[PDB]
Amino acid sequence: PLAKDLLHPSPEEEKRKHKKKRLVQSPNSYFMDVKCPGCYKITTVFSHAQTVVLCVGCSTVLCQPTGGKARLTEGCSFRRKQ
Amino acid sequence: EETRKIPVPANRYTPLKENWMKIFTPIVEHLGLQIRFNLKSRNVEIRTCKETKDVSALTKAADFVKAFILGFQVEDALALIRLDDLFLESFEITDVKPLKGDHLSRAIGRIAGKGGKTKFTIENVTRTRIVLADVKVHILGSFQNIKMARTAICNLILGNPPSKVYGNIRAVASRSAD
Amino acid sequence: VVADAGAFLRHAALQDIGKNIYTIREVVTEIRDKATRRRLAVLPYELRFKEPLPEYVRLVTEFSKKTGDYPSLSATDIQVLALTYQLEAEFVGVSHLKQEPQKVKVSSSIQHPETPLHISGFHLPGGWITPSNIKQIQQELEVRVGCLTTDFAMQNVLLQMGLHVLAVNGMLIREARSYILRCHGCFKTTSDMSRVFCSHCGNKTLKKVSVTVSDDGTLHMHFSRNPKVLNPRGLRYSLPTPKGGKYAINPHLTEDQRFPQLRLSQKARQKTNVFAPDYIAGVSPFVENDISSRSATLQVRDSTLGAGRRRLNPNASRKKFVKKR
Amino acid sequence: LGPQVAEGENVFGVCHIFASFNDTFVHVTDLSGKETICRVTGGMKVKADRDESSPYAAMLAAQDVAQRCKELGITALHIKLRATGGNRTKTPGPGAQSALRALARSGMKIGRIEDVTPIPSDSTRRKGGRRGRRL
Amino acid sequence: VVDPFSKKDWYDVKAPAMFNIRNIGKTLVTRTQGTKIASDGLKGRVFEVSLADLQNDEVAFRKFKLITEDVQGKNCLTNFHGMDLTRDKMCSMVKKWQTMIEAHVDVKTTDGYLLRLFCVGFTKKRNNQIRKTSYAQHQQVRQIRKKMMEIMTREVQTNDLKEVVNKLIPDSIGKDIEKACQSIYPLHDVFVRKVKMLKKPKFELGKLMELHG
RNA sequence: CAAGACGGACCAGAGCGAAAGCAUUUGCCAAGAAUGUUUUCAUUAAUCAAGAACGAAAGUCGGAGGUUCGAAGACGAUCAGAUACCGUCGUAGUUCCGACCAUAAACGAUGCCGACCGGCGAUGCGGCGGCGUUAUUCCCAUGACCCGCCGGGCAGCUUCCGG
Ligand SMILES: [Zn+2]
């Protein structure tokens, strides 16, 4: 208290903070690259997707909507993009 | 050989554990009764053995342990062990007046008073012991003394201030050949 | 056959079993109970007082600091232990005894430290207290020299050495299981079960750990692998500003802080005893309460009273219309 | 006159001890409860309405019932305690305790102590008003 | 003046074959005086027998209502009528910082006895729990209730009174409910607290013979 | 056996609702907060004279029903002067349906919206990150606990922030 550099805070405090209460707004979501266990097709899936996404050339369910992050089916592979 | 089993709540387990020697020693020493505490059924078990001196001692011990479980001190129920003409009468606080919520809590307050003082004053005049469970009142004493104590408590929990109750019970205790 | 204060405190009529009955003067002069002091003026006088030369006291001291029981014992306990050591050296050969005691081995279980095992009355699934078991329920019951000691720490160091010990019973004891307090900050163990602040780091952090000692000299400690024991739930809460005067009650943070004197009056701290021969002459079945003293208006309570209230965590919800003293 | 039982086994009755807040009833019945054996009130032992619910009347009642049951061969009793129940108070009074102790003294083996007080699930309105009850 | 108990008779009252102890007591019946038959007069009596008086090893907080049906020469043959927990046990089980879950079914046995079963269960505090309360949410409560109804419905429909009474004595239904409800919320003290007799078939004499011996 | 009533204990400084208020099971019906979103619109907002929905209990009209309780009223006791208290019975009412009434210590005796100024950990819901125990070691997720973090809540403790 009484001594806090408001311009340059630690990354731990900014990741701890609510997303609208950061020094500059930044979302907590991401676009993850998903590969089905069956086919080789690349799909891009939002981390908090509300809709059930299907593989285009396989017609296979990739994830289910949840209260927060969309959980993937078992066996699917994913990586966070950039 | 017959037995009596009485339950214990979760809030009286630790007082039972701390006061356990002071409970089981008078029951087994001069009354001659077997005693155990079943942890699975949460029951105090009192039994008659060959060493029991007389009949109805097991009833005396059952009243003693029941009074301890209801919230009385170990010596105040050892009074039930020694004396014959002592009883344990209890009632709910809503039995005389339908009280809801905060009103009810205030009624509990004016059985206790500040620091418990009011309660102790009744215990000084009526020669009883009063235990206040959460919505329950238990009186230990003689029959006429139980009547005086319940009159004081019922007067308190329908609105009377404590000073009027003190004056009334002191006049009654003067009239009761105490 | 040496007698500690626990022999006379528990009324051990054991002068017949022994012949080398040796006691210190300070074990017999520090007793304050009137009944056993009256008993000592009636009992047959076969005991004789004997004082140890201090080389044995020195050696008992350096392995008392090694066994981890030196803060637990007192000075007169060291005197009694040196007395039985020096008589075992004087009469029996000394080479029977091993020094520099063994290492303790760790074996933990899932049982809570507050599980009521080895309590005589309690029974899980028979365990009965009968009139034929009262004289026998003392502790876990199991040639020329012996002890009459009930304190556990002396027994712990004594069986760590290897002297046979006996109690107010007849037959000697081979195994001793009990409880100790262990600090989980500084890892210093105390045999004093009454204390709540440890002697080394001074924090309110001692927790119960069970111990078992064999006659061979093996100590082993049972810990509890229960996360409820080491849970920091109600430990951090806002404390009020420190207050002084004649009526302040501070939150008791250290073992030696100076509290103001707030004692109950003698009428307030009398409990009725019902088996007195003159009890029936009384006008009331119970002792009259204290409603007139100044300690009644200040709501002074006994130290043992209200223990479960202190055990609730302060960051919780009490009932709306109550105040916690 | 009574059951033809060997000395080892006991004859069981069921003693309903109902302590109302004006007197006390000691009602020994069959194990079924349909056929009765004995019953004396607080009022048939003391000749005063003031002392009708007193433990004196209850204990005299218990001795009278115990003697009558010794006459008819019943040696042991199960106990079914009772208060008025319903809207009223639920705890059996000191008269029920006095009757229980007095029949315990009078040579009776005691079976099961069980409380049947008619606790309502969800009651009707109390006999007193909003102002209160009992002085 | 004339003693009423001189004309009375003592009849044996005996339990069915499902229990180890048969003779559950004596009953007092006024003799047949021409108009009313003593055998017919005793035929509608309900006996409240604690289960520890019926089996040696079994716990004593369960009571069986047993109704008599036939008279066999100073023997009163008896049949199962109901079952209920002791009020002391019920008052001890209802603690504060937990949830009470109730269920009931109207279910019919294979031999025509229509019963009403009640089931009580409590949420359990775990052995490492720090929180004071163990409240279950409403959908969890509904799922537990639905599972209890399904379990006791399938356990009573497939049997008659013989196996139903034989599984009510150790409460196999209660232990099955406790084991099956762990995947939703851990249950603490589950019992079939009450069994009611709603409908009985036409009375048969042979049926009581295999129920007795 | 029937009748009407009421949903105890569980039941908490817990929850929901604009308030009055709301607690037996199941099903149906439309609502709603909060949370989550790198969704969409792009100032659409706040407070509001006039006006309008809801509004405990009591009470008034029509119908039904009346278990308990019960104003009035009838008795019995109680006393220099008692006509309120107490006990028994009991009508309107207390219950339901459809119309009225718009009042309470209808309370936090504290307008609503927005901003800033000390701290702490419990709880309710949602979300996130997790080493472990459990659904007799669960074959993988998922429920129950355990440790933190974020958002909106019901509240609490502490403080010489300032008043
Ligand atoms: Zn330490």
Curated annotation (Swiss-Prot), chain A:
One Gene Ontology biological process: ribosomal small subunit assembly
This protein's record includes keyword Phosphoprotein: yes
Protein name as catalogued: Small ribosomal subunit protein eS27
Ligand binding (Zn(2+)): C36, C39, C55, C58
HAMAP family per record: Ribosomal_eS27 (MF_00371)
Pfam families (alphabetical): Ribosomal_S27e (PF01667)
Disorder: Diamond-Blackfan anemia 17: A form of Diamond-Blackfan anemia, a congenital non-regenerative hypoplastic anemia that usually presents early in infancy. Diamond-Blackfan anemia is characterized by a moderate to severe macrocytic anemia, erythroblastopenia, and an increased risk of malignancy. 30 to 40% of Diamond-Blackfan anemia patients present with short stature and congenital anomalies, the most frequent being craniofacial (Pierre-Robin syndrome and cleft palate), thumb and urogenital anomalies.
Region (Disordered): 1-22
Subunit structure of this chain's protein: Component of the small ribosomal subunit. Part of the small subunit (SSU) processome, composed of more than 70 proteins and the RNA chaperone small nucleolar RNA (snoRNA) U3.
UniProt record similarity statement: Belongs to the eukaryotic ribosomal protein eS27 family.
Known role: Component of the small ribosomal subunit. The ribosome is a large ribonucleoprotein complex responsible for the synthesis of proteins in the cell. Required for proper rRNA processing and maturation of 18S rRNAs. Part of the small subunit (SSU) processome, first precursor of the small eukaryotic ribosomal subunit.
Subcellular location field: Cytoplasm; Nucleus, Nucleolus
Any GO CC annotation of this UniProt entry: GABA-ergic synapse
Biased composition (Basic and acidic residues): 1-15
Record has Metal-binding as a keyword: yes
Entry-annotated residues carrying Phosphoserine: S10
Curated annotation (Swiss-Prot), chain B:
Keyword annotations of the record: Acetylation, Nucleus, RNA-binding
Gene Ontology cellular-component terms listed: cytosol; nucleolus; nucleoplasm; nucleus; small-subunit processome
Source superkingdom: Eukaryota
Major subcellular site: nucleus
Ranges of residues in domain KH: 101-153
Record bears the keyword RNA-binding: yes
Cell inner membrane recorded as keyword: no
One Gene Ontology term from the biological process aspect of the record: ribosomal small subunit biogenesis
Protein's cellular compartments: Nucleus, Nucleolus
Transmembrane stretches, start-end: none
A GO term, aspect molecular function: RNA binding
Tissue: Expressed in liver, lung, spleen and kidney. Weakly expressed in thymus, testis and ovary. Weakly or not expressed in heart, brain, skeletal muscle, placenta, pancreas, prostate, small intestine, colon and peripheral blood leukocytes.
Its biological purpose: Part of the small subunit (SSU) processome, first precursor of the small eukaryotic ribosomal subunit. During the assembly of the SSU processome in the nucleolus, many ribosome biogenesis factors, an RNA chaperone and ribosomal proteins associate with the nascent pre-rRNA and work in concert to generate RNA folding, modifications, rearrangements and cleavage as well as targeted degradation of pre-ribosomal RNA by the RNA exosome. Positively regulates dimethylation of two adjacent adenosines in the loop of a conserved hairpin near the 3'-end of 18S rRNA.
Entry similarity comment: Belongs to the PNO1 family.
Summary of subunit composition and partner proteins: Part of the small subunit (SSU) processome, composed of more than 70 proteins and the RNA chaperone small nucleolar RNA (snoRNA) U3.
Protein name: RNA-binding protein PNO1
Species annotation: Homo sapiens (Human)
Swiss-Prot record, chain D:
Naturally occurring in which organism (per UniProt): Homo sapiens
GO annotation, biological process: cytoplasmic translation; erythrocyte differentiation; maturation of SSU-rRNA; negative regulation of transcription by RNA polymerase II; ribosomal small subunit assembly; ribosomal small subunit biogenesis; translation
Gene symbol of the encoding locus: RPS14
Subcellular location: Cytoplasm; Nucleus, Nucleolus
Residues that bear Phosphoserine: S123
Phosphothreonine modified-residue sites: T117
HAMAP family in the record: Ribosomal_uS11
Region (Disordered): 115-135
Gene Ontology CC annotation, any one: membrane
Keyword vocabulary terms for this entry: Cytoplasm, Isopeptide bond, Nucleus, Phosphoprotein, Ribonucleoprotein, Ribosomal protein, Ubl conjugation
Family: Belongs to the universal ribosomal protein uS11 family.
Domain of life: Eukaryota
Cross-link Glycyl lysine isopeptide (Lys-Gly) (interchain with G-Cter in SUMO2): where in chain: K45, K47, K90
GO molecular function: mRNA 5'-UTR binding; RNA binding; structural constituent of ribosome; translation regulator activity
Protein name from the UniProt record: Small ribosomal subunit protein uS11
Subunit annotation: Component of the small ribosomal subunit. Part of the small subunit (SSU) processome, composed of more than 70 proteins and the RNA chaperone small nucleolar RNA (snoRNA) U3.
Residue ranges, compositional bias (Basic residues): 126-135
From Swiss-Prot, chain E:
Origin superkingdom: Eukaryota
GO CC, any one term: cytosolic ribosome
Modification N6-acetyllysine occurs at: K14, K36
Crosslink feature (Glycyl lysine isopeptide (Lys-Gly) (interchain with G-Cter in SUMO2)) location: K14
GO biological process terms on file: cell differentiation; cytoplasmic translation; negative regulation of apoptotic process; ribosomal small subunit biogenesis; translation; translational initiation
Coiled coil, from the record: none
An example Gene Ontology molecular-function term: mRNA 5'-UTR binding
Keyword Cytoplasm found: yes
Keyword field: Acetylation, ADP-ribosylation, Cytoplasm, Differentiation, Isopeptide bond, Nucleus, Phosphoprotein, Ribonucleoprotein, Ribosomal protein, Ubl conjugation
Compartment list: Cytoplasm; Nucleus; Nucleus, Nucleolus
Protein modification: ADP-ribosylated at Tyr-135 by PARP1 in presence of HPF1.
Residues with PTM ADP-ribosyltyrosine: Y135
Subunit structure of this chain's protein: Component of the small ribosomal subunit. Mature ribosomes consist of a small (40S) and a large (60S) subunit. The 40S subunit contains about 33 different proteins and 1 molecule of RNA (18S). The 60S subunit contains about 49 different proteins and 3 molecules of RNA (28S, 5.8S and 5S). Identified in a IGF2BP1-dependent mRNP granule complex containing untranslated mRNAs. Binds with high affinity to IPO4. Interacts with DDIT3. Part of the small subunit (SSU) processome, composed of more than 70 proteins and the RNA chaperone small nucleolar RNA (snoRNA) U3.
Family as reported in the entry's similarity comment: Belongs to the eukaryotic ribosomal protein eS1 family.
Protein's UniProt name: Small ribosomal subunit protein eS1
Source organism of this protein record: Homo sapiens (Human)
Shown residues in whole-protein numbering: 21 to 233 of 264
